[PDB]
Amino acid sequence: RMPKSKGATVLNLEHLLEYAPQQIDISNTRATQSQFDTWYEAVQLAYDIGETEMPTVMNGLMVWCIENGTSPNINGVWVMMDGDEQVEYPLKPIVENAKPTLRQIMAHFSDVAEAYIEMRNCKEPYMPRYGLVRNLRDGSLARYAFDFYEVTSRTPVRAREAHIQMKA
Amino acid sequence: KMRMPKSKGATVLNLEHLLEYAPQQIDISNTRATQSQFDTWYEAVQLAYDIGETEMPTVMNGLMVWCIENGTSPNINGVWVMMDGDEQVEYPLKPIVENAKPTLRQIMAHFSDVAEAYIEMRNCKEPYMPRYGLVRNLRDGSLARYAFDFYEVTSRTPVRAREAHIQMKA
Amino acid sequence: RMPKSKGATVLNLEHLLEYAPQQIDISNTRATQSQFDTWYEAVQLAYDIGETEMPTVMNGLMVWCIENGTSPNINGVWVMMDGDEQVEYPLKPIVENAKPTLRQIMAHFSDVAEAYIEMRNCKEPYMPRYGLVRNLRDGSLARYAFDFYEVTSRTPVRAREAHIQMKA
Amino acid sequence: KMRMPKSKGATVLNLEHLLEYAPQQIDISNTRATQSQFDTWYEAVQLAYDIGETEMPTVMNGLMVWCIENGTSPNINGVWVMMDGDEQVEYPLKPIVENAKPTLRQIMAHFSDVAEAYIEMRNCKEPYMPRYGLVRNLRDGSLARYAFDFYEVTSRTPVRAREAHIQMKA
Amino acid sequence: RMPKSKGATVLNLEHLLEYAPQQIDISNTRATQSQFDTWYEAVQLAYDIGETEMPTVMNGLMVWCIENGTSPNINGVWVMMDGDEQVEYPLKPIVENAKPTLRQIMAHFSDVAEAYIEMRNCKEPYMPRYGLVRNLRDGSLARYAFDFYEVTSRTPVRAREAHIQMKA
């Protein structure tokens, strides 16, 4: 029974047959590109940094939000390590301009965060602090141990169960 | 014997027509909005979006797939997105929700049959569990054509699917 | 010990021996005839319909209240199908003039509703939506799956147990 | 859906009356003669026997008890007897059988309810198995109120009794 | 191997794909409509009754042929009950004009007879006399206990077995 209004479908099954959006582009668990660009272009201006080294700053922020979380203290600072030295940045632009929530704005790093949490597991065991605080004892699930992970149809069932365990 | 209803000695029912009055459950159900409430909504979104009488079908395709993976109770102040090839086309949700009487779920229940059909073909290429089942621990994959908020449980629905919806709900 | 006031019974056992009212005529689970007539004659006037086609409208309303219930939204509409077309009627006269409650006013259709919920089971399985929403999985009890059923001494024990299951 | 009978687009049945038309099985059954066939018989025997409109009831009492212990298919040329105290009053069977349409058994089926009642009271003093069960090896005594040729098996008849009649018959 | 005469099929598979007659319209277990109309219009004339009350007479006849059968004595009478009174009608027009057989002419009442043999089972047990004489001891099969039932693909296997038991 196709929907209809006035003797005409209100759908196109030609288009639909070939309309297949990925879940992480239609899903609301992740901010839209227009929202990501607004956040990125606002953090870039609020940090007095150009495109030359802004990507480098984003490497630290992602690695911070894997070890700390995506619900920080707005009146605080996120830390980056320039070798043995410490680099401190404000979290006002990070949280203020991250619409709707910083997790949705950080969900765009779910694939890279997954790579970096396994790319640092090679060689030596490594486990984010969103799993060490939430009682996770299995290193095989360290990949999925960060707040801004995107649960999709490709997520392992075991991974999709750690999250509900860690989230409670 | 049966006591047929009577007002002043006259049956208040027509039995010649009751025997031949078998409405499909969906047409008189209250989980679906009336076609007079769909037409008002449909036309309203055409007015708000300025989309012509053509091309609306393709906007309804984005909303249907969007309402499978997101839900039928979004924020009235947000924007739902549909993929124009590789880009992202954002539309406002105000006409969708403001003109959805009684609710968007009942307005979107008109797409239930197509919704399950869409999932199957999507699932006929690679696994596709709609987000409404991923955020609700729906683990069996066969019952992935019923993992959307605007599904109408009818007399033809598999009993499992019915039990599953009792699980996703709360 | 017969009741008495002043050395005379306050009962007539002659009459009583042969006073046997059916339960659905004395019971309060069903509106009185004077109340049914008032509701019927008010819905008839509020719908601008005569006796010629009012019975036909009542066929749809009963079939609606088997699939929806007897506690609807007063500021709403009940649907009837004139073939493939939809016929919409207000629920103001239905609920406003149904004293004490629309269920008591619709309890007069318990026998016919029972017939129509089994008369549509012949040929193809059919189950009201007051059982499909209230988790009923037995088709043999589809007859008794509507809000305005009249529980009498003739109700099967199994039927009288589905209702307490569906009612909670 | 049900296909109600129709001649030229009009149902050939009245449904307002079918719902309220529950005939007792005996009234339209064919194991019992019509009351228009009983009245003709009854009156005929009054004419043949010259018995008045009074005293016929007492002659029908002898025939009923006689037809329990003998059968409802006697010889048209015989005489059935009723006991007037201690003596024996013989009546001719010609009016009984000649005017029994379609048959005497169907004419005598009007006495079935009384017939079983008569046996019970008779059995409530000393054993009384009607000869129709003695010459047919009917051994259980409780089912002795159904051991007469003109009994009408209805929806209220005990299933045993029904099986027993299948045994007495042949 | 499609049938053919002279290099052309003698069938149309276009039509056939969508030619689906119900079994009770093609089957010979039931008289044709032209035969039913002839019988109905002959019984109507032979009974000195108009369309006003002919349907009422047909209610009694169906209920008679459920309790007696469809092979009666042509030189006889079928009984109807006008309350406590008896109404006698001839069986000459019923049987004389019922081509090919009265059962085929009464097969048109199979659906209604099924309804009325269950519509009288509600409330109190009821069993036709075509089952009480043919040794049937199961009330669940009382619906199918009449001579002019139409055995179709939708008949329950248990029902389709009572008939061969009752028919022998």
Author numbering:
A (entry chain Ak), C (entry chain Aa), E (entry chain Ae): 55 to 222
B (entry chain Ab), D (entry chain Af): 53 to 222
Excerpt from the paper describing this PDB structure:
To better understand what drives the orthogonal assembly of the trCP-derivatives, we analyzed the interactions in the locally refined 3D reconstruction of the trCPK176C cubes of 3.2 Å resolution. This revealed that the hydrophobic interactions between the P-sides of the ring pairs on the C2 symmetry axis are crucial for stable assembly. Two subunits of each interacting ring contribute to stabilization, one through the residues of the α5-helix from the core and the other through N-IDR residues, including the α1-helix. No disulfide bond was observed between the rings, because the C176 residues in the adjacent rings are too far apart. M54 in N-IDR is crucial for maintaining the interactions, as replacement by Cys in trCPM54C+K176C resulted in the formation of H2H double rings instead of cubes.
Potyviral CP plays a role in virtually every step of the viral infection cycle, from transmission of the virion by aphids, virus assembly and disassembly, regulation of genome amplification, protein translation, to cell-to-cell and long-distance movement. CP consists of a highly conserved globular core flanked by two large extended regions with a high frequency of structural disorder. The C-terminal high intrinsic disorder region (C-IDR) is partially conserved and packaged in the lumen of the virion, supported by the helical ssRNA scaffold. Here, we show that we can control the shape, size, RNA encapsidation ability, symmetry, stability and surface functionalization of nanoparticles through structure-based design of CP from potato virus Y (PVY).
